[PDB]
Design a protein around this ligand. Structure first.
Ligand SMILES: *[C@@H]1O[C@H](CO)[C@@H](O[C@@H]2O[C@H](CO)[C@@H](O)[C@H](O)[C@H]2NC(C)=O)[C@H](O)[C@H]1NC(C)=O
Ligand SMILES: *[C@@H]1O[C@H](CO)[C@@H](O[C@@H]2O[C@H](CO)[C@@H](O)[C@H](O)[C@H]2NC(C)=O)[C@H](O)[C@H]1NC(C)=O
Ligand SMILES: *[C@@H]1O[C@H](CO)[C@@H](O[C@@H]2O[C@H](CO)[C@@H](O)[C@H](O)[C@H]2NC(C)=O)[C@H](O)[C@H]1NC(C)=O
Ligand SMILES: *[C@@H]1O[C@H](CO)[C@@H](O[C@@H]2O[C@H](CO)[C@@H](O)[C@H](O)[C@H]2NC(C)=O)[C@H](O)[C@H]1NC(C)=O
Ligand SMILES: *[C@@H]1O[C@H](CO)[C@@H](O[C@@H]2O[C@H](CO)[C@@H](O)[C@H](O)[C@H]2NC(C)=O)[C@H](O)[C@H]1NC(C)=O
Ligand SMILES: *[C@@H]1O[C@H](CO)[C@@H](O)[C@H](O)[C@H]1NC(C)=O
Lengths: 106, 50, 170
């Protein structure tokens, strides 16, 4: 409706008997392949991303936002637990880091 | 000639692979929309008869 | 073919030019309408040969290889169910090219979700795409993943009911 791509903002310009809209949009570019999974199996529990998506560069699993590649460590703060690992089709095994663990470790 | 609808592109679909963007382009596009016309009035009596 | 009639018709001026111009404007407007509706993608996307979409069946909407027209069964049913100086101009886009445009749109929305409409087509598994759509309407991803077989069965049943309803309603 407001240009090709993900619309950010627009500018109006007057024209003789008309209007010209300059649509400023966000276009994704330089995409890269990753191996993906619906959920992460850890401690008999299924972990799902709160806002992102699980990606793998070949050896390590990360969670990133969907429209830009920004890999982050899969923790309990960006994932939520629902059910066990027996129901989700395509769940893979990976560890889930806990930020609270070094606090009581020390 | 018979027209070509578009450049051919086969998306590499598989059940466990995703494509994630690593960069972006800020694209500005133009959209021209007419708003008004010339306001014309015709004297019907003068036009038909003068 | 009457010369006298045309000679008398020339006394009325450029009425014929106005009518021909208006009809020409309508005729080009129809082609512009078809371009605006169907020609919104410049890439012709194609489905993978293996139709492994996590239980989702798209055979009723994807083009049938057995048919020479390369139409879907639903599109084939739709085409079956629709039946002195005048000329009919052919449309600029033929039915097979319009079907090809719809096939490209279907392949893009199945293999890439909404990514192809906003830029380059980014591949994503179809259950993950459905989970994204579930998050769009405010339902968590887990609900989609846990009940994926049920959702696929419901979707296939609904598509079959659509084909039956179109075939059974005049
Ligand atoms: C995937 O990315 C991770 C994180 O960038 C890579 O892990 C790093 O690999 C380098 C190169 O050997 C090491 O020096 C770092 O110490 C690693 N970091 C961690 C936290 O282990 C990983 O190697 C990448 N995998 C592939 C296949 O490229
Ligand atoms: C992911 O981890 C689970 C849990 O350990 C694995 O499930 C086990 O699989 C072995 C062999 O198939 C069985 O003998 C165990 O009884 C299973 N345990 C449970 C709790 O189900 C699963 O196979 C692992 N998957 C991968 C790909 O490594
Ligand atoms: C992700 O991987 C797929 C396949 O591993 C790549 O698809 C191939 O792209 C090349 C380059 O044009 C084609 O010649 C092949 O025919 C494609 N294969 C298939 C099966 O379609 C894809 O390009 C990769 N994506 C990125 C961003 O590198
Ligand atoms: C993302 O893309 C931008 C441009 O779209 C890249 O910026 C260019 O970077 C090269 C090399 O660093 C420069 O020679 C160009 O002049 C830059 N262009 C502009 C407009 O600044 C940027 O480096 C890309 N980033 C990644 C990570 O690929
Ligand atoms: C997808 O749906 C189609 C249509 O419902 C299935 O095709 C049917 O397959 C069965 C057994 O193979 C036949 O008895 C039916 O006559 C077929 N129907 C039609 C309309 O051809 C197809 O098997 C389903 N699954 C896949 C993976 O394509
Ligand atoms: C993808 O399909 C293969 C079979 O071709 C299967 O072994 C694998 O588990 C599937 N992965 C997912 C995530 O569904």
């Amino acid at each position: 409706f407001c240009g090709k791509g993900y619309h950010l903002m627009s500018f109006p310009q007057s024209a003789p008997h008309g209007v010209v809209f300059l649509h400023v949009t966000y276009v994704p570019a330089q995409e890269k392949n990753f191996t993906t999974a619906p959920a992460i199996c850890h401690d008999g529990k299924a972990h799902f991303p709160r806002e992102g998506v699980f990606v793998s560069n070949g050896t390590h699993w990360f969670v990133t936002q969907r429209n830009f590649y920004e890999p982050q460590i899969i923790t309990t703060d960006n994932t939520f637990v629902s059910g066990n690992c027996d129901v989700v089709i395509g769940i893979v095994n990976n560890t889930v880091y806990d930020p609270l663990q070094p606090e009581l470790d020390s | 000639y018979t027209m070509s609808l578009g450049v051919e592109n086969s998306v590499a679909y598989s059940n466990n692979s995703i494509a994630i963007p690593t960069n972006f382009t800020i694209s500005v596009t133009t959209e021209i929309l007419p708003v008004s016309m010339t306001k014309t009035s015709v004297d019907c009596t003068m036009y038909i008869c003068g | 073919d009457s010369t006298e009639c045309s000679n008398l018709l020339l006394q009325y001026g450029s009425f014929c030019t106005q009518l021909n111009r208006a009809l020409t404007g309508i005729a080009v407007e129809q082609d512009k309408n078809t371009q605006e509706v169907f020609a919104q993608v410049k890439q012709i996307y194609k489905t993978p040969p293996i139709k492994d979409f996590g239980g989702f069946n798209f055979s009723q909407i994807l083009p049938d290889p057995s048919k020479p027209s390369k139409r879907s069964p639903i599109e084939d049913l739709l085409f079956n169910k629709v039946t002195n100086g005048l000329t009919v101009l052919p449309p600029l886009l033929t039915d097979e090219m319009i079907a090809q445009y719809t096939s490209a749109l279907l392949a893009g929305t199945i293999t890439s979700g909404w990514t192809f409409g906003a830029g380059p087509a980014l591949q994503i598994p179809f259950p993950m795409q459905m989970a994204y759509r579930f998050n769009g309407i405010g339902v968590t991803q887990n609900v989609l993943y846990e009940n994926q077989k049920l959702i696929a069965n419901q979707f296939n049943s609904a598509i079959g009911k659509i084909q039956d309803s179109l075939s059974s309603t005049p």
